Amino acid sequence: VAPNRSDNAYADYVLDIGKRIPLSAEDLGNLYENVIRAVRDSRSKLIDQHTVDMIGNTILDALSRSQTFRDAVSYGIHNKEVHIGCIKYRNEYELNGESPVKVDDIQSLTCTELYEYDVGQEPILPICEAGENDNEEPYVSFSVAPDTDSYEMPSWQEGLIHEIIHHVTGASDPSGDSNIELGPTEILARRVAQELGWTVPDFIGYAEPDREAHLRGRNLNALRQAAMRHEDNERTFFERLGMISDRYEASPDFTEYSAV
Ligand SMILES: [Zn+2]
C-alpha cells in the first residue's frame, strides 16, 4: 500500500500525506522559533558563526518559501517521523584514505595542506549524514558553510536540505549503486532547490560519477573557504574542527577566534 522508503515514489507519497494538515501561520511561527533554538543549541558542534547563520537562514528560507519543504516538514510532525525543531547540526569530518598528508590528526592540519592536493587526495572529508546520538536525538552532520556569494552556496544549501529530509520524512537514498535514479530524498531536495531558486547541476543518478565528483569538489572548496575565513586563527580553527570530529562540545561562543 505504501512504497519502500528507497523508491522514488516515496517522495510523492509523503508530500500528499503532508498536505492533509498544512502548516498554518501559527504552526510556521512556532517552527521558526523552534529552528532558531535548535540552531542556537547547535553552536557547540559547528565550526564558526558564519556556518551557524547559513544553516539557520537556509532552513528558515526553506520553510518560508518552499511548499515542498513545508509539506515534508508537516508530514514528519503529523506522521511519527522527526519534528524539524528536534534536529541539531554538526560539522564532523574524517581523514581521507588515499591522502598522502604528513599528519594523522585533524587538529594539526594547515591551510596549505588543503590547497596542496586536489580532489581525490585531500586530507579530510565532511561526514554528510542524518543520524542520531545514544539518546536517539536526531542530528545532521554536514560540510562547513562556504562563503556568502560563493559558487558553492546553492549546492551546499540543497545538500543541507537533503539531510534534513532524511529525518523529517523518513525517506532513504537508493538501495544500491544507483546511476539512473536520484532516490526520494534527493528528488525532494531538488524540488525544494527549484522552488527556492538554488541552481544546482542537473544530475539523474544519486551515485553517478559526475555527482560524486561535484560533491567532492564542493566540499573541498567550502572547507578551503572556511579555513581562509579564519586564516589568522589557523591553529584554533583546525583544533575546533578536530574537536567536533571527535564528538566533543566546543565553545558555543567561538572562544578560539576571540582576541583573548
Ligand atoms: Zn542522503
UniProtKB/TrEMBL annotation:
| Positions bound to Zn(2+) | 162, 166, 173
Q: Which residues form a coiled coil?
A: none
Highest taxon above the source species: Bacteria
Keywords, A to Z, come to: Metal-binding, Zinc
GO function terms (MF aspect):
metal ion binding
What range does the record give for the signal peptide? Answer: none
Q: What is this protein called?
A: Non-LEE encoded type III effector C
